Structure formats: structure tokens, C-alpha cells
Amino acid sequence: MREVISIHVGQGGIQVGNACWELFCLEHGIQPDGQMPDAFNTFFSETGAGKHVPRAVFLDLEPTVIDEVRTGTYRQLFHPEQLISGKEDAANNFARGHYTIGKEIVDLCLDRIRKLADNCTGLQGFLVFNSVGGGTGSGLGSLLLERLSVDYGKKSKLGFTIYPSPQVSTAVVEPYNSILSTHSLLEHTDVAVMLDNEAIYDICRRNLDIERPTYTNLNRLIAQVISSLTASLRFDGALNVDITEFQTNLVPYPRIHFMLSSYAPIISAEKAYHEQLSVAEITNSAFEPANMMAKCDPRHGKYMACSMMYRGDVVPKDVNASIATIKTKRTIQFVDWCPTGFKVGINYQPPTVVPGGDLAKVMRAVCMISNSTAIAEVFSRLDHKFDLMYAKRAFVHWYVGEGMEEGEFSEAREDLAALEKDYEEVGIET
Amino acid sequence: MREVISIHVGQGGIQVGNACWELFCLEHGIQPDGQMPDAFNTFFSETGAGKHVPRAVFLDLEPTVIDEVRTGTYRQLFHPEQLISGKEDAANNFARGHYTIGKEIVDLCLDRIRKLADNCTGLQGFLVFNSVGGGTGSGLGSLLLERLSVDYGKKSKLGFTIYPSPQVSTAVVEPYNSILSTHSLLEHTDVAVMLDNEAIYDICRRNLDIERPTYTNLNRLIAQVISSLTASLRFDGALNVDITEFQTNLVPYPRIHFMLSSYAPIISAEKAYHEQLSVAEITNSAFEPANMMAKCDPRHGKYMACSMMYRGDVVPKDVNASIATIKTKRTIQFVDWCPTGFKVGINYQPPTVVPGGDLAKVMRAVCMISNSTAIAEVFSRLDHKFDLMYAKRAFVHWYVGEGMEEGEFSEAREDLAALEKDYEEVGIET
Amino acid sequence: LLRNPKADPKILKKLQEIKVNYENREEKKKLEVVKQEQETQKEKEVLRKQLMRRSLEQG
Amino acid sequence: MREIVHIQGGQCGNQIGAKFWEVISDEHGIDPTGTYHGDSDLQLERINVYYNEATGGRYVPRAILMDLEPGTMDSVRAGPFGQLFRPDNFVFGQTGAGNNWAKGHYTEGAELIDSVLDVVRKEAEGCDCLQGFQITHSLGGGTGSGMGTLLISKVREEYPDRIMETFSVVPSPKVSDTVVEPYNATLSVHQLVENADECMVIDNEALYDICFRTLKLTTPTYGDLNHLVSAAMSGVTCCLRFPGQLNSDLRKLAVNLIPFPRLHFFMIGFAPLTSRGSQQYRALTVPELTQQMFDAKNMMCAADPRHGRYLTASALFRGRMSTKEVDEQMLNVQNKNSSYFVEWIPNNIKSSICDIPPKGLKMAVTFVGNSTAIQEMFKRVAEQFTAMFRRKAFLHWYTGEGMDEMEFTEAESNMNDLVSEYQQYQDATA
Numbered sequence A, B: 001m002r003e004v005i006s007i008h009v010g011q012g013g014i015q016v017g018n019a020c021w022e023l024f025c026l027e028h029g030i031q032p033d034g035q036m037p038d039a040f041n042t043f044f045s046e047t048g049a050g051k052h053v054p055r056a057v058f059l060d061l062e063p064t065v066i067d068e069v070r071t072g073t074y075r076q077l078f079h080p081e082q083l084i085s086g087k088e089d090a091a092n093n094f095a096r097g098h099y100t101i102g103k104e105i106v107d108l109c110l111d112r113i114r115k116l117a118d119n120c121t122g123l124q125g126f127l128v129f130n131s132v133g134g135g136t137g138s139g140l141g142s143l144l145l146e147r148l149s150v151d152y153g154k155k156s157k158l159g160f161t162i163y164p165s166p167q168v169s170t171a172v173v174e175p176y177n178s179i180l181s182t183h184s185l186l187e188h189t190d191v192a193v194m195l196d197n198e199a200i201y202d203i204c205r206r207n208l209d210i211e212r213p214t215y216t217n218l219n220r221l222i223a224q225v226i227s228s229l230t231a232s233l234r235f236d237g238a239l240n241v242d243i244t245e246f247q248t249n250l251v252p253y254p255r256i257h258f259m260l261s262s263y264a265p266i267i268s269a270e271k272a273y274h275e276q277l278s279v280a281e282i283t284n285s286a287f288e289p290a291n292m293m294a295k296c297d298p299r300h301g302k303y304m305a306c307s308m309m310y311r312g313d314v315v316p317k318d319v320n321a322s323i324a325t326i327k328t329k330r331t332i333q334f335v336d337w338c339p340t341g342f343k344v345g346i347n348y349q350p351p352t353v354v355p356g357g358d359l360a361k362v363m364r365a366v367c368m369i370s371n372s373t374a375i376a377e378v379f380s381r382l383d384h385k386f387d388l389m390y391a392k393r394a395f396v397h398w399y400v401g402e403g404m405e406e407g408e409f410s411e412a413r414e415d416l417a418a419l420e421k422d423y424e425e426v427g428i429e430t
Numbered sequence C: 001l002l003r004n005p006k007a008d009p010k011i012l013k014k015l016q017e018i019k020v021n022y023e024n025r026e027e028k029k030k031l032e033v034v035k036q037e038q039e040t041q042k043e044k045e046v047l048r049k050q051l052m053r054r055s056l057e058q059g
Numbered sequence D: 001m002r003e004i005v006h007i008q009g010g011q012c013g014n015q016i017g018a019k020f021w022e023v024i025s026d027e028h029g030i031d032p033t034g035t036y037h038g039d040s041d042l043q044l045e046r047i048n049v050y051y052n053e054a055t056g057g058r059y060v061p062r063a064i065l066m067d068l069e070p071g072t073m074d075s076v077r078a079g080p081f082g083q084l085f086r087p088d089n090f091v092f093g094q095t096g097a098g099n100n101w102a103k104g105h106y107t108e109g110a111e112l113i114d115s116v117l118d119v120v121r122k123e124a125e126g127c128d129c130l131q132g133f134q135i136t137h138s139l140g141g142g143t144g145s146g147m148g149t150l151l152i153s154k155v156r157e158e159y160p161d162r163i164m165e166t167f168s169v170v171p172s173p174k175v176s177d178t179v180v181e182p183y184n185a186t187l188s189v190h191q192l193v194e195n196a197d198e199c200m201v202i203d204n205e206a207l208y209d210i211c212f213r214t215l216k217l218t219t220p221t222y223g224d225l226n227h228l229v230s231a232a233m234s235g236v237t238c239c240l241r242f243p244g245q246l247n248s249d250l251r252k253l254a255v256n257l258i259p260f261p262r263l264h265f266f267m268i269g270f271a272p273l274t275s276r277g278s279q280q281y282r283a284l285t286v287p288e289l290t291q292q293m294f295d296a297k298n299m300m301c302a303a304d305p306r307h308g309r310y311l312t313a314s315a316l317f318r319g320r321m322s323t324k325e326v327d328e329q330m331l332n333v334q335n336k337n338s339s340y341f342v343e344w345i346p347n348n349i350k351s352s353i354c355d356i357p358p359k360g361l362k363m364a365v366t367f368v369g370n371s372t373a374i375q376e377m378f379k380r381v382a383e384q385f386t387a388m389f390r391r392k393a394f395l396h397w398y399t400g401e402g403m404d405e406m407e408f409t410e411a412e413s414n415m416n417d418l419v420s421e422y423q424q425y426q427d428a429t430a
Ligand SMILES: Nc1nc2c(ncn2[C@@H]2O[C@H](COP(=O)(O)OP(=O)(O)OP(=O)(O)O)[C@@H](O)[C@H]2O)c(=O)[nH]1
Pocket: A009, A010, A011, A012, A013, A015, A016, A062, A089, A090, A091, A092, A093, A131, A132, A133, A134, A135, A136, A137, A138, A162, A164, A169, A170, A171, A174, A197, A215, A216, A218, A219
């Protein structure tokens, strides 16, 4: 009687949704056709006899990815008319997907959301995935969040956004729409998790020893993180954690809800079994700055609160004996007004392996969600990138001619300045 | 609950590490794949189910030897990412491996050392192997010792250095880096053992009757000495000795810790069984000047302290009856301020034989570690060799251009002069 | 005694030039990096002043 | 009633206890499983002296085992009768002392001793009427000679009226196994005289001499020396566990053998001792026992008892025999040797008879004599100490852990004063 609905918008969102939906189907024993040859109820729904239907909706204005989905092996799984598709792409223009073509599509998505919500009885909250540096992704994510915040109100929404890397970039105009989308979801989303690609590339290179990774390898790690986060809702555990038990433990103030994640262990089968993978060493590896899932240095800032999930055969006393060691270290310092900052969850189900993938099978794993003061650097560098081109008003004509006003750029800049001032104000000791 | 970590750096270090690691695996019954078909814990660690992983790390900047290791029969034994390898060799230049290319590699080695140390609970100390007359070996050994002396502090470190022979030499510039490395490890290593190749060549020729030896035959004898030294930690014995029980028995003063070793018996199976190998005759052979493992004459100096290990079925009373005979002889004289100078250890496990090797199987053996005043001759001759070329500043440009200062050569000369004066000052009677 | 090696004065001078060139190359790297950071500020102040002027004009 | 607890420290003490408890258990018919299987009623009447009672009818020794390294106690547990010891009484550290007295008495031994003192206090507070403590340790080792002697002072401070026994093995200069023996021997003798109520010196050299000359066995081992020491140890308290004509507890011996409080260093010996081939030739009679009892080679110390004069003597006969013969033989052994007995104290031999002989023997004698000939051992120990100390050899190891040379000077002066004032009474005349 506990449910959650995941929203996938944009090319990156759909490509990570595919990645998480192989993993969930594999973890619950459901074949790609949707047929089994009481834990499924969190992500799926029973049709009365036979197949299961995911509680997910796919959105995009550009039809190529959806058409690829509707012809692959998973054509029989998803309901045919929840893969909403458009005709014309926003083409990396934020104003397009927020004012011009997204408005005519958003009504169908909201109707689908209502039709899925009326089925659930114990709706925990929503999940949303969107790559920020694109037109349709950021614009439609903003519009959907704004509609949901007023249609439903206090229901919790979680956002797994992928911000651009510090120096590596695929587009040339992504700072503009990244800043605008951050403006939009700052006052509209309860949790936002950092996911830039460069850090995960470094993780793959160093640990998985892959020298030529593709997007699928990144999306599989993200899917594993999602599964670790939501395992506690569908498996028995000695110390459970619910989604609604987050803003009471990781969010000191309503404005501050951007945090960065990490995962451990990450290792290949060729050298995994030569070492014992004790809980102490994995919880040490999880706190290593080089294993952050976002390219930010935690040594440059304080910690505010750490929520970290275990799964497997871990014993609570071993967890406490490792939290003490971390509190001992002099290179990791917490904020003054937080004496204890750890929330611990323990689950029994070990992580599942996907055949043909990178990760091996292990009995212990740890996933941490940590809120730290050091996150302000990404905001500062994105702001610096934005200012350089906004000084000469470059690329603005592509946005003014799509219905957006001239002054809309300035207030996003003011909100980022306010956020950066707030992060500095919080981190000073009393 | 007692552990030790061995460090192998340079070509000679890796080639003697291979030699000791066949012997340990053979002695503890572990197959080359790492699988057994409670004494292993000193050198190995249990992975939970199946294989054992050595507590050793291999270092080199030149990749050929490591690549040879990673393709031999022992490819499955060592953890894949503790065989740290570089790209560019130091090429016998000490300044290269201490200032230019060793600094970028030393951090990974220190991270591996930390990851291995956190697993051990009763860490006795470190072992290190390095051929002194090479660039990367001496330079990286110096840098690692200097980092470890401050990271850990009072933990004991033992160095099995191989100094160049009096007249036989492979390089032409090895006195320079030998003197510099002696400078570096004089104030940084607790024990240093002499291992020059010429003495062991003579031992092989005279006893083993091999007229064409290679490096493997030398390394097997060194491995046997290491096994004899560390047997007392992993086998039951009537008179045990620990590593920490050395600086209290063999090191009269903090500066004086260079000593030379010997082993007995050394004999082939073709004529071993024709003679009884009593304890008295083996302990007489061990004290013969021609059986020193370093080309130094003990008749030219006094003894300071003798620590000598037995293993097999030896009885303590027979050991005492042989120590008395040695005290009787007029050709062996101890220093005045040391009435008793013998530390005796007895172990029950006989030495193990390696198939296809040189040594035969025997029930009694003796290994002596003796500190004597005669060691100053090697320092004097190395100093004389150094002065000849340093008078004209030959080969100095290869060192000044790698970041080292001009005056760094002089202070090593001053420290050697101080050491030689100290050895003369100690050996005079009161 | 010590070490009056009778080295050629030309070689001693060349060694001293190599040492000075090494020191000068080491000095020449870091200063440029620090200069880049100093340059990196000023740009933010100019940009922030332009932004503040234009946000003021737009109310 | 009037029972004692057993406390042992160090490797040598643990090996002595491992045979002492076997001998006691064999004497009382206790199987290695703790189940009584004896034949005589007297075997159970006074079993509370050494053994406690637990549920299930099994018996457990009240012994406390301490060492700074876990190897020796991990080895003694696997030996015969190793299961009797309560696992709770095993206390050990993870570092060891390395034969350094300072480490085992100031830095490491001080922090650990609280746990062992807790169990010591638990054992003593509980028992019916305390008689005292007996201590087995070696003066040739660091951890033993440090922690044991500091524990002596701590116990004496809390139980000033109880009696204290110490069986101490001092390092002989003939069979030397450690180079730093004089330092920790001299430091330990300083503290031992101030607190121990009784001390009994035992030398490995004398044990080897006895085994080679009287028993005439070819290959002595530590098991034979331990067996002789164990028989001597058991002989002292025999009449306290069995009925006899003249019972004499330890306090009665303390009254009659110590003339002045600082003269409490005895040397002991056991009779009869015969070879396997001559055990049928000899006939056991009181004259035969008393002639071997006063034999110079039969003493457990290399000290020559005809180089001095006995201050007093004691004998503990075992078996059923006539008292008139014992008294007349004691008188005869004192009339024929008047030159070796001090003249200002008449009738200086104490005798006792116990009706229960050792298992397998019909008569046995334990000899405890306080003689002036013991000065020679302290003389040679101090000679070696002053030969080594004048050059400050190996002094830095001790001075690096908070100790200074002043405590060495005071120890040497006090030991020399003891040597002088012990012989002061040898030349005293009436
Ligand atoms: N982690 C990850 N990021 C992706 C992936 N695909 C695209 N991105 C990121 O998405 C950003 C651009 O947005 P996209 O998702 O590609 O395109 P969009 O969101 O659909 O917006 P449009 O361009 O209007 O179609 C790029 O900067 C990429 O970094 C992916 O498969 N994995």
C-alpha cells in the first residue's frame, strides 16, 4: 500500500529511465514481456491476470527516442499511451519548452498523472529525471513541477538533475537554461541531487577500469543509486527509512536542499573477490572525495547532515564502529550547530547484478546522500559562465523571440546571488 | 593477530620478492592460484571464502618486470591494483627517482600502504627490499622511508639493501647514488642488512658447486634467510623472538644499525646425507669468515652483538655447549664492554625445500644476524670510489639538471665521515 | 682537506648556469598561475557591476 | 582454607606454569577435562588450596595468565591440560615489550595492568582465608621482569599482611640468549628486594648441569627443566595439602628461614634424582636422601654452597618414615660440616614430615637453604652491568620512554649495598 511515480522527460531522462527499468524488472523477477514466469507494488500495478505495468511516464517532444523504446524488447511492457511524444523539438531553447510547444503537451501529461494517481492508495511521492542542459528537459520539467506543486500541494517530489561539468560541455548555451531551470526548481522541488557527468567518468576510469565509457555505463550506476535509495520501501530491514523521513533529517532550511551523492563499492569481478569488502573499508571509500558522484570537493566546505544507506548482511554495531572512526578523522569536519549528523539505514537485500554489465555481485554496499556547504562552487562557476555572455547579450534573441521577457534573466541571477549568500551565512560558526 | 608488510621497489627488489613469494606460498601450502587445495595470517589475509592475498606491494617505474609478473603463473595471486607501475624509468639517476618522476607515483603507493594497514590489527612492522645501486630503487626507497617515518612514527622498518661489490660492478655511477641512499636511510631505517652479490657468488661456487650461477640462485638464498628470520612469528618454538625485540639486543646506539648476515648449512643433496650435520658443526660453519653473506672480513674487527636463529629439532643444551666453544676460540674476540653478546632463538619447523632448487632438505639449520665493527671497510672503499670522481665533478651534470642542488653531495660525504669516526670511537676499549 | 676538485672553471660556470636556469624555470611556472587567479577575480567584479547596473535599469 | 592463588607472567613463567599445573593435576587425579578420577580419599579433602568449584562438578585452577603478546597463551591452550584454565583470566596486549624493561614497566605495562589487577582482586576478595600469592617469572625478559615486579608492588600495597612468593629465573652469563639481560636483571632485582616476602632463584645453567650429570640423559629440553622446577615447586606446599607428623605452612618457613627482612633469597634442590638405568640399583633410605640433598651439584643454582656458610636450612621430607632417624641425620649433617654453618645461631636446620609421598615415589625431599654463597650471582650480574653501562650501550632504548640514568645509578648502588650487607654476616663472629 505504498507507491511512487517516476517522471522521465528529455533524452537524458528517458535514457536513464530505460537504465533503471531494466534493473527494477530484473530485481523483481519480471520478464521483459511483463509476465512473471508482494514487493512489486511500490513500482508496479497488477492488472488482474498476468502482466505488470510500470508506474512511469515518458515525455519528449522529439520522437526518435520514444520510437526506439516502442520497438525494442520492452515494447510490451509500457502502456502504449503513456509514452507521450511531440513532433517538434525545443532545440536546446528553454523558452520554447516553457512557453511555445510545451504548453500544448503538458495537459496530456497531467491527465496521465491523474489517471495513474487515482490508482495508488498510499502515494509516497514523485520522482523526476531530467538533464538540465537542454531545452525540452529543463523547460518541461519546470512546467510540470510548477503544475504539480499546485495540483497536489504537500506531496513530496524528488529531482535527479544532471548539471553540466565544470569544463566539459556538449552544448554552448547550456548555462542559460541551467540557471533558469535552477531558478524554477529552487522554490518548487523538495530534494535535488547532483549528477554531473565528469565525476562519474572519473569513477568509471579509476575503479571500473573502462577507458572508453558510453552513456549506458553512467546510467547503470545512476540506476543502482536509485535502487539503493528506494530499497527500504520494498524489502524487510532492521532500520527502515521512508521518503517522507528526509526533509526532517537532511534539509536544515527550506532553501537548502541541494546535496551530492556517492556509492561504494564500485569494482569489477576480475579483482573483487581478492579483498574482503568489510563494512569499514566500504564506508571509508564512500567518504573519499574522489568518489563523489558530482565533481565537487567536500574538503572545501563543512558537512551539514549525512544520510547513508546500507544493504546486505551488515550488522548495526559494525556501522557504529565505523561512524566513530569517521568522526575521529581530522580531515572531515561538521558544522558547529550539528553535534550528530548521521542517519543510518540498514537493509537485508543485497544489490542485484545486471547481466553483461560492469559491476560484480557483492554482499555489502553503501549509498550516501550528504548535504554539504561546499556545493556553492558549482553555482559560482555557472554564474561566472553566465555573466560572460550575458554582458554582451549574446544568444538572447533566440529567447526573446520565443515569448520570454527581457527581465527574466536578471531575476534568476538575483536568486543565485541570494542562494550563494545564504550558503555563506549558514556555514559560519556561532 | 600479528602482521607484517613487505615493500618491493626496483628491479632487484621485485626479483627478490618473487623469490621470497614462491617460498612462502610453498611453506604455507598455498597453491600458485592462491587457493588451498592459523599461521598464514602473518603474511596473508583471508578474503572470506577461498583465496589468500599477500600483504605485499610491488613498485617500479619501468614496466617490463611488472608485466612479466602479471603474465606468469602467479597472475591470479596478487591483487591487480597493488602492482604500481610507471612509464618512464629513472635510468640509474638518483635525482630522477627522488625529485622528478617518483613524486607523482609515491602518493598511490602511500594510499595502498594505508589501505593495507587498516586491515591489519597487530602490525609488527614493515619490510623493504631495494637494490641500492640503481636510480628508481634507491630514490623511491628513500622517499618511501621518509614518508613512512612521519606518517606512522615508531613502527619498525627493516631494510634488506644490496650494496655493490668491492670490485665487481654492473654500472659505473652506482657509488654516487649508493652514498646518497646511505645518507637517506642512515637516519630513517631501524635495521639495515648487507647483501652484496660477490660474497653470495663465492658461497654458491664453494658450497653449492655451481660454476655458472644466475640471479635466481642468489635470490633463493636471500628468501631462505628471510624465512628463517620470520619463522618465529608463525610457528611454535621453545625460545621465541619478535621483530620488536631487536633494537634492544643488536643496536647499541641509534646510529649503528648496519650488520651482516650468514647462513648454514648450505649443501647439495648429492653429498648432504654423508655427514651428520650436528648443531656444533653448523654453528661453527656459520661463524666462518668465508661464509659471510657480505664480502667483509670479521677478523678485521670486533663483534658487538650476535643474534642467531635455529630451526628444526635442536635442543637448547647443545646450543649452549656450542656457544661456549665459540667463546673459547682465540680468533673471535668480542668488544670489551659486552660480556655476553649472544641472543639465541629456537624454532621447531625445519626449513622447507623448493622443488628444482639448489638446497636439499635438512632437519637443522642456523641463521645468524651479527653486528660487528669490521663493517667500516665497505664504507671506506665506497667513500674512496666516490672521491675519485667527485674531485673532477664527473657525471654531476646528470644530477644538477634533475633538480638537485650542488651542495647535496658534500653533506652525504660529511655524514659518512661522521659514521666512520663513530665506528672507530665505539671500538676502542675503556 | 675536503673537496677542492680541480674541475675546469668553464664546467663550474656551466653547472651554475644550469642551476640558475632550473630555478628560473621553476619560478616562471607558479607566478603565471597566481597571476591567472588574480586576473580571474577582476572579471567577476566587472561582470557583477554590469549586471547590477542593468538589473537597476530593469527595476 | 589457607589457600593461595597462582599468577604468572611472561613466556618463561607461562611455560613453567604449563607444567606446574599438569603436575598438580596428576597429583590430585584431575583429568584434563576437569573431572576427578582419583583413588584415595585424601585426594579431595584439601583440593580448595589450588582449585575452584563450578557447576557440573568440574574443577578450575585459580590461575591468572598475563603477557604483553598473545602467542604464548594461544600456544599453551592447545597443550595438554590447557582447557582447565578459565578463558576469562587470559589478559594480553597487542604490542609486546621486545625485551625492553622500560616498555614493560612504564609505557605499555602501566595501562594494561588495570585489567589484570581487576581479576586478581576478584580472585583474592572471594577466597575463604587467604594464605598468599606465588609468582613465576623470568628476570631475563623485558615484559616479564617489568610487569611482574610492578604487579608485586601493587599487590603488596593492597595486602601488606599476606605472604608473597616469587620463583625468579635470573640470567646466567654462561648460557646467554639475550644481550640486554644485565640491564633488566639489575633493574628488577632493585624492586624485588623491597616487596617480595620470599624469593627463589633458578638458573638454566644449573638445570642443564643437573640433567647432564645426575640424570645422564642425552638430549635435555625445556620440558625436563620445567618438570624439575615443577616438582620443586610442588614439594614446598605438599604438607599444606596433606596430613603429616609436623605440618608447616609457608608462613612458618618464612619465620624460620629469614633472620633479617632483607635476606630472603634462597636456592633450592630436589631429591632423589636418578638415571633410568640406575633406578633399580639404588635403595631409598633417609641417609641416601640426605646425602644427595646437601650435595653441591644438586642445587638448582650454579652458586657453589661450599664457598660460603649457611645462615639456615630447611628440609621437607615426604613419605612415611621415622622421625628419630630424620633428627639424628640432620644432627649428623650439621656436626660433620661445622665449618660451613654460621656459629652464632645454633640449631639452624628446620625439618618437616609429610606422610603422602609423590605419585610413583616412596620418599622425596625438598631443600630450601639460605646461604651466603648467593653473593656470587649478584657480583657477576653487577660486573656485566657496569661493564656495559660505562659506555652507555643500548641506553637510548630505555631513555626514550621516560626513564633516566639516575634510576640506573640508584639500582646499581642498592644492588651493591645488598651484596655487601649480605656478606657482612658471613664474617660476623660471636
Ligand atoms: N548522464 C547523462 N547525461 C546525458 C545523457 N544524454 C544527454 N545528457 C546530457 O543532457 C544535456 C543536453 O540535454 P539532452 O538530454 O541531451 O536533450 P534534451 O534534455 O532532450 O533537450 P533538447 O535538446 O531540447 O532535446 C547534455 O549536456 C548532456 O550532458 C545521458 O545519456 N546520460
